[model samples]
Target chain A: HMRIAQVAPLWERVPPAYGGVELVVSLLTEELVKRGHEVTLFASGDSMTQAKLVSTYPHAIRLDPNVQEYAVYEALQLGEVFSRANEFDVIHSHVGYTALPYTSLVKTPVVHTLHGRFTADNERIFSQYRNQNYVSISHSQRQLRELNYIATVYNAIAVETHHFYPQPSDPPYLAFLGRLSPEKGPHHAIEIAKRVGIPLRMAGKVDRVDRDYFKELIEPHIDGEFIQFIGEADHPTKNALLGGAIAMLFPITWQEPFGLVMIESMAAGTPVVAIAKGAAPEVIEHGKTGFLCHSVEDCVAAVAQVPQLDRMACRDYVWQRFSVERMVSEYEAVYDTVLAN
Target chain B: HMRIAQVAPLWERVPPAYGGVELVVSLLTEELVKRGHEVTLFASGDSMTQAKLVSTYPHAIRLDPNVQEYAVYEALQLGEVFSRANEFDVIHSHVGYTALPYTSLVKTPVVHTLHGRFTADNERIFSQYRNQNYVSISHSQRQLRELNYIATVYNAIAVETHHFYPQPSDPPYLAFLGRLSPEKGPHHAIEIAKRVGIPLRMAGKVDRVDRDYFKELIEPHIDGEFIQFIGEADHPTKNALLGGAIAMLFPITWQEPFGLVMIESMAAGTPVVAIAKGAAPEVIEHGKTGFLCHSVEDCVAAVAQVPQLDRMACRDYVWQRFSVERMVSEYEAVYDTVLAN
Candidate 1:
């Protein structure tokens, strides 16, 4: 079994209630450990993991009220990882370009998994380190022209954790599981739900950065029954919420790198009727798994067709394409390829 | 008279006992204010300045025990500045590339004064944003081949704050001002002072990052009188210390972007006997003002010649070349050039 060092961002803890990246890292680390790989996770002390945990920071930065210097903690985290870099066979960084420089300094090869959308600024920054190995979460997320592309490993979930419901709930609601931000389009989700006369259940954190947006756009509409803002949900509640839903609505505004909610909802045997943005087209097989829509009218119409799409087909698609086993195996293959050269 | 927004890193207060960049920003802001320009300083609330103070954070990060996320505060600081970008005619940033992305977003011109060394990693990072204006503290600091360099603005101090003492102390000792780090060369200063048979006085903050280096390399050698580690010195004590010393020894090991201590020492009428690294050659006029040598033996020989150099010439050199008035006027000229285009 190869020893793998996983460097996660210090902002949030593994198995985070609000963070997609942290949840992905937590799942991958635990899965890698179960597969008999010697895995070491470098994250905040508060992070829960089955792998050997090394805490660079005392607590998750986002959870801490006093913490302000996000980059300083990340630099310290990188220092903690790189100083003891020789201990691992391979370094897997989920922290992005901040970990890129250290890759050249150490003997061990580093494979960076790009978790965020490549904007113009980040695209230019990533271009400078084009020689470094990169794994895109989805094929559509690959925007940078020049990079040592390893493989497009879809972000996976624990398939067993999500109970596959064959039938939809009594008085079924459209679900939205993500941040209450403009980019994620909670407004659009509300609009689609309102247009289709469907009750919507929203479960996600409203980040401090998006407080104004939430106050202005979302807060006015969130009443308990029709547009229920259930706040942030843990794994069990999230699975239960998704499993009981008629369909998940992902009306994203920006070029989302990967929507983990889409797959997570699919794992719960819930079909997604999402706006055709970012990885929506790549993940959802139109007319088979879920319908990819263009506008509010299209999403409203797609909501009606959600019951027609076989819920078991949605559950089987996630098990076949986006499982923890497949993710870990793909990463292992990438590690072998990286180690060979 | 232009409205200048001076953006500083929140790590330390302006006129920081330990920070070089903060000290320079403080001096520049005050001098610009004194010269009839509207100057607003974006720094920690703890900082004392003549310019209109805009506190981005409650206190300097170094002083706060709870603060860990340095970049988060800086991002907040940038948001504080860029959100009101139209309030200033030109934004003078001492915080480096953190302020670069915002330059394109705002109508106000930004002049980023690079206060740190350009490593290979930074070289690539800076290379991406080559269109943004940059000002190097020293000619030697212009390492990045592709950048819109406005002018080399030698970091200046309020020379009037330092008393020009023509005569040295009765038993004059070699002085070392800066950090107790390997790069700053407190170790070399101790070695050269020992070889030359002169007493040495060291004054600077031993940063938490360099505490191990200080404990292992410098702590054992401090014997109060012979080799005294006076700890972090405030302005009055720093000036008095520099004024009484035979010569300030700056045997720096790294490519120091600009040694503010070198100019500060010269302002106190103390000649600097420094190693020929980075800005040492640019600042120290050999034989006339101070000697710049390559080796410890050469530095030992240079210390002996320090008594022969004119103390008034050292004082006058700083007045002519590195005065706060000169720094502000050159920046004004750069601002005009930036605004004209």
Candidate 2:
């Protein structure tokens, strides 16, 4: 059994109220613990984990009202992980390049998983840490040139948590799950739904950063009936929302790193109709599982084709490919290679 | 009595552990309350004040281990203020342009005091909110082309709080107070001190943002006898440090909006030996209060002339110019003028 140290971002707790990175960290740590591995998870103190939890901060930074400078807390969080780097055989960092520079100093090898988009600024920073091992969530997320690529590990989900529905519910509505941001394309999602003549149920957090965007664009359109903004949904509600929907609309404008919503939608037997940007093609099977398109008109066309796709096939696809067990086994193989070297 | 709302940055308390803006806010709020004005201070919940305190957050963001994204909390903080904008006659914002856009929507006028430097990015943002009432700390701080300038209010400190020394301590050391950052010019201060052959005592917080700069540039040079890096100094220690020093070295690089340390040093009867950058010329009366110089050679020469300067003169200058009484009266005048219109 390997002694693994999992370092997560300080922004939110493991099994976060609503965050992709924190959710993955929570899932990975719990799965590793059940697999008889000695895992020590570094996250917010409020985070619940079966493994030996070492908190760098009292609670999730996002949850705290007093938090001012985020970079300071992140620096302290990274410091906590590296200070005890000698104890672990392999350190898995989900907090990005913050833990990269410290990797060379420690005797233990580190595997940094890229969870955000690789912008020009990120490319410049990542270039300095090219020697460190990296795991990309999707093949397309490897946009930056020349890094020590270890493996492409897709983000996994607990298949048991989601209730799969073979048939669509009464008065079927199109689903949109994510933050209300320009890049996430909540506005485009609305346009697509309006164009397709479907009632859209948007369930996501309008984060403080995107409050202006929410107020200017999305908030004006939210009527409880035709264009329902269901605010943020927790596990049970999220699963139910996704399971009952006709299809999930992901009209993303930017090159997203790895959209977790795609897999979550698939796990609930909901076919996604996403624009062909970022990891859309990689996540969605163009003809079999879901439709991937280019323009707003293309997204509308894709929504019409959603009913033709097999719902049970979408559920089985996620269960076989994006399950927690498969994710853990792949990570174990990566760990073995690092230790052997 | 006019009802006034003092909106402070959520990063720290009104009387911060170590912040100039928050400290000023604390002083102004208390001064207003003493003047029999109805004052409500909007700051971290942990902040203590004589006035009616309305907490934007539970504690200072800098003190909280859990805070990540600051803008989110800032938005929430501003929302807390503007949602009840009708309660105050005037909103004195220390949080900058984050509150600027909302000012137009509310009936109550806002007096935004620009604390940070007017960078190109700031110029662009401020241009959009040009109609909003603006206050500059110094005449030099009014760097941008055009804006609604109400007054140039020099940041005030409570003169009673700072300890005044009539004479310098035995074997007096040169002082450097502020963050360990390149722009703050701790490196330049070290060079000037070494040139003058004066023992320098540096006291300030090394922010997480400047840790790399501190490690690479400042840390290696810290010798116990010659150059001492006293971590972070609280009010009493800071007062003692400033009061005892022969002259405070402020060899700053950037165009600082207001060097609070310059006035703080003056209040302690310690003459400043500073580079003629930013608000140095505006604050210092050349050869009377402190020597404002051009180059490293000039700073070294100015250090030699520090003992000749009258200590009582420095203390008197701050009492007359940069007192809490003067600041409150000036703001009161601005509030009356705004209300009259």
Candidate 3:
């Protein structure tokens, strides 16, 4: 058994309300513990974990009205993790470039799991810390080829916990999961649904940064019957939503590092109709689990054919490919490699 | 003498045109070399110094149209310094919180100079790196009292380079030397000169961030005779501008951590009528060197009395307190203490 430190951002609690990073952290931490490894999690105080929890603030800084300076908590999180760097056999950082400067400060090996994509801003950060160990969630996310990515581990889900539906819902409505932002392309999902005349049930949080984007592009088109906007969804609602859909839409405009929603939908026995950008081709087997499309019209055509795919095969694909058991084992190997050195 | 690494920001060349931090770095680097200490300066390639120069870029990034990603150069600057941390006994950083995280990585000691003031954005960074060694340029700069500040050394200028005048210019005028921004309070300087009916001559760069403020408030008042905004000033131009004035105005609005221009004006045999803000009282010897005033009306009254003061005494004050010899020796003590620890 190995001793590990899982450093998570304080934006959301573990097993997050709608957090991809937090969900991954929660799953990885629990799976590592179940496999008899001692783990300590550095995250929000409100976070629930079987591991010994260490947090600087009382709750998520973003959710609390009292906390204004987010970088303060961010720094404190760094302090809490790196100050005791030697205690852990391996420290796994999901907080991006914040921990890179502290890598040389500790003799203990640290593996950075890159959860985000390379942009004009973060490109330098990845470039600067190119010498450190990294685990890619998708092969497509490796924009900076110089980064010392030790392994490529696709983001996974809990197959045991996921509620699988053998049959699609009556009337066969379409579904859209994730943020209501321009990059996720909810507008494109709406266009596909309207073109095909299927009810599009959308569920996700509208971030303050994307409020105007949601209001102008998404809100104007929302109707009670044909086009429904469910503001936010809980775990059960997500299961119910995905299980009841004919197919889930993931028409992202940007190069999404990896769409966790694609796997989550597939796990619930729903085929995905996503834009052929980013890791969609890697996650959705193109012709098997779901269909990857180029445009709204192409997605509309894919949505029609998604019903022809077997729902049992969709559920089984996520179980074999993107399960908690596989991701945890991959991470274990990453730690073993570092310890061997 | 100990081996020292003077880590400077790559944004500008040392002995910079309008850079205050870069000027201090340039002066510190050369003085340490003159005093028989091995020094390596990490700055832009265009920087001229006696010390061995290590740079990542050819020239200042802000001036060059080529470099789009500055964070790349910034991270490269960090790599250049800390990667070779063992080569130096003490690493003096003017790059702020960038180097703080690397403090514990090496056996060599790192000392960061407090240059910028505590703002809403940077407060967390300073607070997070609070455990690292710091040297305050002004006692007023020690806002975060919890910081492990080793010493307080005032920033210095070379008296040899500054051409001192024994007398003020005939047909006397008021002067203002700094960025034409709101916080520097060039508008307040404008108000002070207008009330006294003296011609106010100003020289400094208007940063792109302050272009709107300059165009709105300072631009309207720039008449050729009563008021003149003489854009950017070189070394000789600065000597001529400050040497001729009756009194230079230091009417700043914010808590200026250390006003280098206050000492620069006083060095040129010109008395200063400053609004008693931040380090004004410490830099200006109230009644003798320059009068610290409360408001614009008070500054106007101080301007009248400035001509009565001896110009020789004004120049002598800076030589005693803020000269390069004193600053270099003070930094030497800082390095020895770190080595001793």
The candidates, ranked best first by TM-score, are 3, 1, 2
Taking the tens digit of each residue's C-alpha lDDT, what string does model 1 give over B1-341?
88999998888888647788888888888878888998899999998988889885678988688666565466556666777778998999989765665565457889999988887445544775688888998999988758999998888888887888888998878889988889988999889999999899999988776988999999999988999988899888889889899999989989988888888888888998888999889988898888889998999998887878889989899888888888888988899998888
The sequence of per-residue lDDT tens digits that candidate 1 reaches over residues A293-341 is 8987899988888788888889899999988889989999999999998
Writing each residue's lDDT as its tens digit, candidate 3 over B48-148 gives 99999998777888777766666667667776787788899899999876566567567788999989787754666677677788899899878789888
lDDT of 2 by residue, A201-236 (tens): 888887676877998889889855699876888888
Off by over 4 Å in 2: B1-341
Q: TM-score of model 2's chain A, to 2 decimals? A: 0.97
Candidate no. 3 TM-score: 0.81
The weakest ten consecutive residues by lDDT in model 3 chain B span B97-106
Clashes per candidate (backbone, < 3 Å): 5, 3, 0
TM-score of chain B of each: 0.96, 0.97, 0.97
Query: lDDT by residue for model 2 over B1-341, one digit each (tens)?
Result: 99999998888777544899999998888888988999988888888888888874577877677665565456555656777778999889998765665665568988999998876445645776787888889999898849988899898888888889998777869899998888789999889888889889999988776888999988888878889988888888888888899999999998988899999999999999888989999999999989999988999999999999999999899999999889989988888877886
Report the C-alpha lDDT of model 3 over A1-341, residue by residue, as the tens digit: 78899999888888556788999999999888889999999999899999999987768866677767665676567767877887899999999776776786678899999998788656766776788999999999898899888999898988778899888789888899898888899999888899999889899988776977987888889955789877778788988898899899999998899998898898889999999998888999988899988988899888778867988999899989998889999999999887787
CAPRI class of candidate 2: incorrect
| Position B127, candidate 1: lDDT | 72
| Candidate 3 structure lDDT | 0.85
Between candidates 2 and 3, the one scoring higher on DockQ is 3
Instruction: Please identify model 1 stretches exceeding 4 Å from their true place.
Output: B1-155, B158-341
